[PDB]
Design a protein around this motif. Structure first.
Motif, mmCIF file in Angstrom:
data_model
loop_
_atom_site.group_PDB
_atom_site.id
_atom_site.type_symbol
_atom_site.label_atom_id
_atom_site.label_comp_id
_atom_site.label_asym_id
_atom_site.label_seq_id
_atom_site.Cartn_x
_atom_site.Cartn_y
_atom_site.Cartn_z
ATOM 1 N N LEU A 81 0.824 -1.202 0.000
ATOM 2 C CA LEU A 81 0.000 0.000 0.000
ATOM 3 C C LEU A 81 0.861 1.257 0.000
ATOM 4 O O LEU A 81 0.714 2.124 -0.869
ATOM 5 C CB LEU A 81 -0.936 0.003 1.204
ATOM 6 N N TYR A 82 1.795 1.355 0.950
ATOM 7 C CA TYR A 82 2.523 2.607 1.123
ATOM 8 C C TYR A 82 3.334 2.950 -0.117
ATOM 9 O O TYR A 82 3.209 4.051 -0.667
ATOM 10 C CB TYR A 82 3.416 2.530 2.354
ATOM 11 N N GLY A 127 11.891 -3.016 1.031
ATOM 12 C CA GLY A 127 12.139 -1.762 0.356
ATOM 13 C C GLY A 127 12.920 -0.761 1.177
ATOM 14 O O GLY A 127 13.271 -1.021 2.331
ATOM 15 N N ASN A 128 13.196 0.395 0.583
ATOM 16 C CA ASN A 128 13.906 1.458 1.266
ATOM 17 C C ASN A 128 12.931 2.382 1.983
ATOM 18 O O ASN A 128 11.713 2.202 1.938
ATOM 19 C CB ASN A 128 14.758 2.252 0.285
ATOM 20 N N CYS A 129 13.491 3.377 2.668
ATOM 21 C CA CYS A 129 12.687 4.249 3.513
ATOM 22 C C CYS A 129 12.107 5.438 2.764
ATOM 23 O O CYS A 129 11.094 5.995 3.196
ATOM 24 C CB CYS A 129 13.524 4.759 4.679
ATOM 25 N N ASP A 130 12.727 5.845 1.658
ATOM 26 C CA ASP A 130 12.361 7.117 1.040
ATOM 27 C C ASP A 130 10.931 7.100 0.516
ATOM 28 O O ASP A 130 10.240 8.124 0.550
ATOM 29 C CB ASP A 130 13.340 7.456 -0.083
ATOM 30 N N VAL A 131 10.469 5.950 0.027
ATOM 31 C CA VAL A 131 9.176 5.903 -0.648
ATOM 32 C C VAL A 131 8.033 6.172 0.325
ATOM 33 O O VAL A 131 7.102 6.925 0.016
ATOM 34 C CB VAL A 131 9.004 4.552 -1.362
ATOM 35 N N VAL A 132 8.087 5.574 1.516
ATOM 36 C CA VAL A 132 6.949 5.603 2.424
ATOM 37 C C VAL A 132 6.715 7.019 2.936
ATOM 38 O O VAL A 132 7.638 7.839 3.014
ATOM 39 C CB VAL A 132 7.184 4.618 3.581
#
Ligand SMILES: CC(=O)N[C@@H]1[C@@H](O)[C@H](O)[C@@H](CO)O[C@H]1O
Ligand SMILES: CC(=O)N[C@@H]1[C@@H](O)[C@H](O)[C@@H](CO)O[C@H]1O
Ligand SMILES: *[C@@H]1O[C@H](CO)[C@@H](O)[C@H](O)[C@H]1NC(C)=O
Ligand SMILES: *[C@@H]1O[C@H](CO)[C@@H](O)[C@H](O)[C@H]1NC(C)=O
Ligand SMILES: *[C@@H]1O[C@H](CO)[C@@H](O)[C@H](O)[C@H]1NC(C)=O
Lengths: 49, 70, 22
Positions: free
Chosen positions: A32-33, B47-52
């Motif tokens: 989702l995110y 995944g990486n942190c930037d997307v969220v």
């Protein structure tokens, strides 16, 4: 979310509820995110039609 | 918070959500208050942190470190 | 072990034991 039906209403952020509702059908909630924006623009578009 | 970032990687709770009374962060189940210490067991990485959106910097603890000393 | 009624002593294995020599 669903909680107000069960008992007293409990505040909860909307993105969190969307993530839960994704868990309900068997898709890991992180999906989702990393797509949040996209999904939103579809929702507002689809309701428009 | 939605997620926790440790080394650029973004973590997610296996079940339940993260909370904090200001002092420390905790992970708890949904329908009942029962905090436990954050761990790489009841979390997972994707995944990486930037997307969220709306992530919070913190530290994830690993219980294997005290045990591997012996 | 204080609260739950009917609790029983037993040995719990840990997979770390065979490889703790590292
Ligand atoms: C304001 C306050 O009481 N914060 C406490 C914190 O100091 C304590 O370490 C933690 C573990 O019990 O629970 C909470
Ligand atoms: C807005 C913000 O918090 N940025 C920090 C950044 O300065 C830091 O380099 C990184 C690792 O410590 O975590 C994040
Ligand atoms: C909540 O609103 C504030 C004000 O715009 C914003 O700075 C913040 O990023 C928001 N929190 C999250 C998790 O999005
Ligand atoms: C089960 O029932 C018997 C007879 O009442 C009783 O002696 C025993 O304490 C019970 N078992 C446990 C673990 O309480
Ligand atoms: C279970 O372990 C504790 C700790 O040694 C011991 O005191 C207790 O007697 C044990 N229970 C039984 C029935 O022996």
């Amino acid at each position: 979310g669903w909680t107000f039906g069960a008992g007293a209403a409990l505040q909860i952020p909307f993105a969190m509820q969307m993530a839960y509702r994704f868990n309900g059908i068997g898709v890991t909630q992180n999906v989702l995110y990393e797509n949040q924006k996209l999904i939103a623009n579809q929702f507002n578009s689809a309701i428009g039609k | 918070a939605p997620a926790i970032c440790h080394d650029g990687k973004a973590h997610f709770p296996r079940e339940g959500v993260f909370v904090s009374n200001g002092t420390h962060w905790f992970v708890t189940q949904r329908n009942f208050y029962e905090p436990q210490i954050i761990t790489t067991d009841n979390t997972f990485v994707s995944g990486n942190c930037d997307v969220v959106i709306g992530i919070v910097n913190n530290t994830v603890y690993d219980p294997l470190q005290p045990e591997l000393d012996s």
